[PDB]
Design a binder for this molecule. Sequence first.
Ligand SMILES: *C/C=C(C)/C=C/C=C(C)/C=C/C1=C(C)CCCC1(C)C
Ligand SMILES: CCCCCCCCCCCC
Ligand SMILES: CCCCCCCCCCCC
Ligand SMILES: CCCCCCCCCCCC
Ligand SMILES: CCCCCCCCCC
Ligand SMILES: CCCCCCCCCC
Ligand SMILES: CCCCCCCCCC
Ligand SMILES: CCCCCCCC
Ligand SMILES: CCCCCCCC
Ligand SMILES: CCCCCCCC
Ligand SMILES: CCCCCCCC
Ligand SMILES: CCCCCC
Ligand SMILES: CCCCCC
Ligand SMILES: [Cl-]
Length: 263
Amino acid sequence: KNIESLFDYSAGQFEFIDHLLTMGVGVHFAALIFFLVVSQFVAPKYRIATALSCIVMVSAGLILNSQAVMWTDAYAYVDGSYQLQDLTFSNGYRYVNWMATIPCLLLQLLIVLNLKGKELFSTATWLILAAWGMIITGYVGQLYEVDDIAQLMIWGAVSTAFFVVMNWIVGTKIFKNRATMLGGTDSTITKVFWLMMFAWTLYPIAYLVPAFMNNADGVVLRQLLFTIADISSKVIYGLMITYIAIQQSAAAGYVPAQQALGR
Ligand SMILES: *C/C=C(C)/C=C/C=C(C)/C=C/C1=C(C)CCCC1(C)C
Ligand SMILES: CCCCCCCCCCCC
Ligand SMILES: CCCCCCCCCCCC
Ligand SMILES: CCCCCCCCCCCC
Ligand SMILES: CCCCCCCCCC
Ligand SMILES: CCCCCCCCCC
Ligand SMILES: CCCCCCCCCC
Ligand SMILES: CCCCCCCC
Ligand SMILES: CCCCCCCC
Ligand SMILES: CCCCCCCC
Ligand SMILES: CCCCCCCC
Ligand SMILES: CCCCCC
Ligand SMILES: CCCCCC
Ligand SMILES: [Cl-]
């Protein structure tokens, strides 16, 4: 049910996909250590936002590791190409994991936007419902990327509706709350918005690869898009969220944040 199963792979194609995923693992787990160490310089009000980046680093890192091992489990080099041995690799495992990681990405945004109490809980609930609707419909849609491309497109259209509503909530909360933000992070958070719009849109482009490049090189392109998108939406994003957290902490008078930025 996945286009990966349709092709034999050259060593170059197969090993490049493996190296992309392994590089992704190393980037996420290196970033994890950074987020862990700097969390002590974040004030209590914001510290969960940096903890959430640690959670996302390990959760996404584990899925990228799992995809890499599944990839090498599923194929063997036979007669000059990597040939399918087991019908077990699928990008669908990424979608299941997004059910956890996308809420974490959204929640750490809400924390540095200074949302509290009922608004934080209400906003998180609606964002997570929209995200889950997007993920579930996209997951069903990619089950058909071989058998029924029309069905892939229609589930993709429904998923995109959820995506667009989710992004409207995200953008509205960012632009309505950037005046609360301290230490110049009213500017920084605007760039976070655009980083999200760019990086998250790479995922529906990857989803459509079976429709516009259904060959072994499109399989590579999709893994490349996922890799660009993962590093941008989780690592670069998380570094920006943590910068905003530490900068607002120092502006609020948290001494460890002030001393950390002074060094
Ligand atoms: C770290 C993982 C992230 C930020 C994943 C984000 C995923 C999406 C924005 C997925 C979007 C989709 C659509 C807009 C339509 C096609 C189906 C999806 C689920 C791939
Ligand atoms: C006013 C408090 C917001 C409650 C949750 C709103 C969730 C939808 C956000 C739409 C843009 C404001
Ligand atoms: C304040 C404007 C920041 C814009 C950042 C660019 C991210 C989106 C560019 C997409 C162009 C294809
Ligand atoms: C070997 C190709 C690497 C692909 C992943 C690079 C991620 C780029 C995201 C933005 C980096 C500044
Ligand atoms: C394969 C190891 C990749 C390490 C990249 C370093 C990323 C820096 C994150 C702070
Ligand atoms: C797309 C096939 C792989 C699916 C991964 C596991 C999904 C189980 C929950 C629906
Ligand atoms: C307060 C209502 C905001 C609309 C959120 C829509 C998300 C779709 C989830 C079903
Ligand atoms: C210092 C932590 C980096 C761990 C990278 C592990 C890559 C398999
Ligand atoms: C007619 C093509 C529409 C495709 C919509 C799918 C978007 C992910
Ligand atoms: C992608 C939708 C952006 C919403 C911007 C709303 C500004 C108040
Ligand atoms: C002293 C550590 C500062 C960390 C800033 C976070 C974003 C780079
Ligand atoms: C990387 C271990 C495989 C399970 C993925 C959560
Ligand atoms: C405000 C519209 C954002 C568009 C992102 C592609
Ligand atoms: Cl992920």
